[model samples]
Target: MKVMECQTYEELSQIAARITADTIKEKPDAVLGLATGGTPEGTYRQLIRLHQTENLSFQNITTVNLDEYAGLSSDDPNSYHFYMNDRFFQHIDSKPSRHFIPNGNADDLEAECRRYEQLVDSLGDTDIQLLGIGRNGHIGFNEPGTSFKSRTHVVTLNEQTRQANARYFPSIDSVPKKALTMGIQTILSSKRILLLISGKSKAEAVRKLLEGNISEDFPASALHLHSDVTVLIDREAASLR
Candidate 1:
């Protein structure tokens, strides 16, 4: 695991975008693991800027998103599908067919989990997997106590997670209680992991991630088990360390 601290969130986002662009340049057909939410929003914006200004292309790249809210349709404004298109995909030269996100509204969620897991397995190892840590250390909705050996599956969102995400929805009652997320083992399978964190609210989590023990109680700690993991954190988020 390597930690790269930046003076500001913009710098962190720039560095993350450069790394992503480099990966795509190295392998035009590289499979990219993407994340959502506020932490990665700037990174996505930086990537879009690279696409527009530097002519960086995602036309041949394949993208797999980390998770999506259960029961939300692709067209739903709050769904990860819409989030991806609105924030990144539509701004790039990427092919819509090559972009994959878990079907959150599938009638049979269990079968959807199996299908999504199979799809990920069939795509081979991801070249780079992007991640963002929840305030409680959750990664890809694999909250605290999630099995380190778990695969793609549905998870019941904890109260804290729901409350944190409440801002995105009209109310806490409207937030989905469950989500489909790639498990710790699945995330660790990626050839490289890129974790982006900013803001003082995440300072303690960043400290725990960098200085804490390896345990399931802190899902992001599972990244320690991977061979290649890069943590790009801004000053505020790294303040506790």
Candidate 2:
């Protein structure tokens, strides 16, 4: 595992762009593991900027997102599918066929999870995964106590996670009780993983992740098991780390 500290989100974003450029240069059709939420917002912005200024292209890349709120259709604005396209995808060169996000409204969630896992497997597993930490130290929606060997599945949100994400909804009542998130095992299977966290609000979670043992109690701690995992933090989030 390698970790780098940066002074601000701007610097962090630059590093993220370099990683994306490197990944694309190595394998244009590489499978990319993606994330949604505030932590990755700036990174995606930087990627879009790179595409605009340097003509960076993902024409041959295939992207699979990390998670999405359960019970919402891909067409719903509240869904992660809309979030990805509005925030980053539409600005890039990748084709719709090369993209994938869990179908949150699938008739049978278990079947959907199995299909997602198979899709990832068919592509020879994800080459690189970009991730964000939940305030409770979760990688995807794999809340604390999730088994290390689990794969894509429906998981009930932890109370802390629900509260933290409640800010995005009209009210706490509107937040989904469950989410379709890739398991910690699924995320770790990627050949490379990059976890990013920023701002003072995340300092303690950052500290716990870097300083603790590889216990599922802090799900992010499992990153320690991945030989190629990299953690990048900005000053505010690294204040206690």
Candidate 3:
């Protein structure tokens, strides 16, 4: 894994935006993997800004999101669907049909999850995957103890994830105990992966992800095995280490 340290979040976000813009310039039809949460918010903003100011187009791109709360219908204001539309996709030229987020409300969730895995494979692995680590080092909802070979599926939320995501819901009771998320294997299979870390809360996890073994204990450490992986970090996220 390679780490790119930036003095500010702006620099790191620009680096991510440039990577997407350059790829879109070369291959109009790029398969993009998206991430949610506070970590990637700046990156999304920069990418959207470039799309508008410099005429970056997403008409040819296909996208897949990492995870979403299972009980929340996308129509719900707090849903990942609402999150993406409000934050990024609606403002861009990307087609609605080309976007992929697990059907959180689907009855055949297992089949849907498997289809998600197939979705990635059909496109010949993700061109680039954007990621955020949980406090425990999870990528997506692949919490600690998840096998390295796992795939997309319904997963019970870890305590840290549950707490981290609770802000979106009314209370702990309002939060879904289960979420549909991409598996570690699916993430590790990506052609390129970029992880972003920002804020003091994430510093230790980010440090371990970079310095620890490629172990299941730290699910995201699987990125260490990838031939192409990069981390863009800001001062707050980089913290002491």
In model 3, the Cα lDDT at residue 197 comes to: 84
Q: Please, what are the lDDT tens digits per residue for candidate 3 over residues 138-216?
A: 8899999999999998999988888888887789778788889988888887778888888888888877876767778
On lDDT, who's better, 1 or 2? 1
Model 1 worst lDDT window (10 residues): 19-28
Off by over 4 Å in 3: none
Q: Which ten residues in a row have the lowest lDDT in candidate 2?
A: 20-29
For residues 1-56, write the lDDT of model 2, one tens digit per residue: 78899989989878987896788779757888999888888888988888889888
Write down the RMSD of all candidates, one decimal each.
0.8, 1.0, 1.3
Residues 83-154 of candidate 1: C-alpha lDDT, one tens digit per residue = 999999888888899999999999999899999999999999689999999989999999999999999999
Native-to-model Cα distance after best TM-score fit, residue 22 in candidate 1, in Å: 0.9
Rank the models by TM-score, top first: 1, 2, 3
Clashing pairs in 3: none
Candidate 1: stretches off by over 4 Å: none
Best by lDDT: 1
Candidate 3 minimal-lDDT segment of 10 residues: 206-215
